[PDB]
Amino acid sequence: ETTALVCDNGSGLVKAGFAGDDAPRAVFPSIVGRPRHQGVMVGMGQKDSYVGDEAQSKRGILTLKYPIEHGIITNWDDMEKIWHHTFYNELRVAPEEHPTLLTEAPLNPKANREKMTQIMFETFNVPAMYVAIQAVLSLYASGRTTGIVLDSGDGVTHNVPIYEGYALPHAIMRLDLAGRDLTDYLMKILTERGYSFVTTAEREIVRDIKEKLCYVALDFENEMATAASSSSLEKSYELPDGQVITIGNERFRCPETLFQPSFIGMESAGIHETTYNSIMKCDIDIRKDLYANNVMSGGTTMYPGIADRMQKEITALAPSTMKIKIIAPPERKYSVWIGGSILASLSTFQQMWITKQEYDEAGPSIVHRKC
Amino acid sequence: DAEVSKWDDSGNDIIVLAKQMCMIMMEMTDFTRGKGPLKNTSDVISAAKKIAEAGSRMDKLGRTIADHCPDSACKQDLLAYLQRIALYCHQLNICSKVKAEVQNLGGELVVSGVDSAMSLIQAAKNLMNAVVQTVKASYVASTKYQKSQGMASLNLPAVSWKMKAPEKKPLVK
Amino acid sequence: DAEVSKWDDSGNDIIVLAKQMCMIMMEMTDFTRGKGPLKNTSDVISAAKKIAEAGSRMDKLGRTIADHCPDSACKQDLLAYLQRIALYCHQLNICSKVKAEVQNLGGELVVSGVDSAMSLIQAAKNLMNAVVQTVKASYVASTKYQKSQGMASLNLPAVSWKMKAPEKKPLVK
């Protein structure tokens, strides 16, 4: 009765569904495209915004905007179009009778979740609401209560170290390098062969390139010496207009900026010594249980060979007696949602919602106290 | 497509109409393969003037809901598809009368069945691809504003629309 | 651990229930070294949905003792472990449906036995470690408040719990 909704509204992809299930009912990209050309036929027009899946079948006449950049909602009029699309047009539910479980990255602005609270209560009129952290929900879905979670998505990657249900907020690190900064590095790195992708609708083609041909080399300075001696690493890809491109050493140079972020001009360290500098800011008694429970979540952690590369780079930093086990589940793209369906369908969680009656005695500043 | 096949025939007046039009268009799409009741081009013209008449009645059914909708920000997703139905039925009326008189003035050797009546299938499957978004944008406009005055007089509850919740997306592969 | 092995099988309802759950957990423990009746991953999922049902009955039996305690100063150590077994069986129910669909969609080659079914063993080791504290916190609340009215109606004397006195500590070395 009154099954809750779990809407993980990440950057780049929106995953929604019902609480208590094991798979999302709605996975569509988080874009709102508007037409940029001149309409000549009468009737084609009077429709100035395509949201989600029909803005990628009809791209090529649209300019595609992302409302969430770096985990922060930049466009508050286009984010209401995606929430209106994912309730009525995509899930086919009425939000007046279901409580929703939203999802936010750590270390975001406090006025980002202050306006998600205002929108769901004064526009969609949900009975109850709750805003959770991403990397705490990918420990629910992993069968653990202790561990350190590297959650690499599209806007941000962050580490949250948790020991026996107790989080250490002084050791939560956050990078703004993520998967969308590997798409924009692949557009620049492909111009050395002649292929120039420019437009916003041509960035979705080079995004589909990195999901199919890109991988992580276990030894980078050796792999660049065998990518030039022979041509056994090259693979071909067919564009939507029939042209065939050929990619050589740009298959592993694109996910290598997660481990060497000096390729994009960032001064920060890689993701292998960000997940280690946050272990070494935890207390000494719990470091043996974080080396062995190293949960990897999110979509950008799905390259072939990102687990065997990351075990190589923490064992070179950790002491030689610790064993290091990296937990990469096969379904780790939807791990943040599955732990959201676990938490919202819980028997002891049902007194932790922010009810609509509670929203009147406070303002939108109640979400900081209750979450 | 298969979205119309995922509905039930015991629905309201719009879903029983939108499922009749997909049964007409299913007779025309396999004419490219020749596995239907339409034998030659002279049945494709009579079927195209049938789907253009049924499509011209959902323009009338959709506009009664667009008049009872009180919010001006809600009809803009609905009137954008009622203007595409009004065009795609006007092409199917006139570009069937053209292919009727070409068949009489020239004979049977002029039109070749497949790859000659494909101007009638293309204008029909673009009507069907613009008629499932005026039963989806009309389902939103009749249940989001159900409690408003005027919409309840149409007698269209949310249980009358026979659309279900979608299927679970696959986790791997 | 070996504390459950030191209990007798002729006890009351809670001791005979916590003896069955350690027999299920011992079938998943040796699967990490491959010496158990559970041969592949498809038997670990059936056992994890079995230990999540037997562990969901001690949440029922543990709450018939927690409400009969007279004051709220003694059940704080009992409700703290009853809320942990509410979480550890909800993970075992849902993360067994998730690992059943991954085994069904991608096939049997995606799961690898060891290092793939360890997400169910780790959530079951934490259920067993939070159910032997639920026996020990319920043994205290059943004998410290035995003479009060309400606790004697459960028919739980101190002799029904078959837990013995601990061993002598070693003096040297």
Ligand SMILES: Nc1ncnc2c1ncn2[C@@H]1O[C@H](COP(=O)(O)OP(=O)(O)O)[C@@H](O)[C@H]1O
């Ligand atoms: N096979 C893949 N290889 C590399 N990157 C991938 C792959 N599949 C998805 N991604 C990336 O994952 C991101 C989308 O997945 P997800 O982490 O759920 O996104 P978000 O957190 O923005 O909702 C995108 O940046 C996409 O490029």
Ligand SMILES: [Mg+2]
């Ligand atoms: Mg995410």
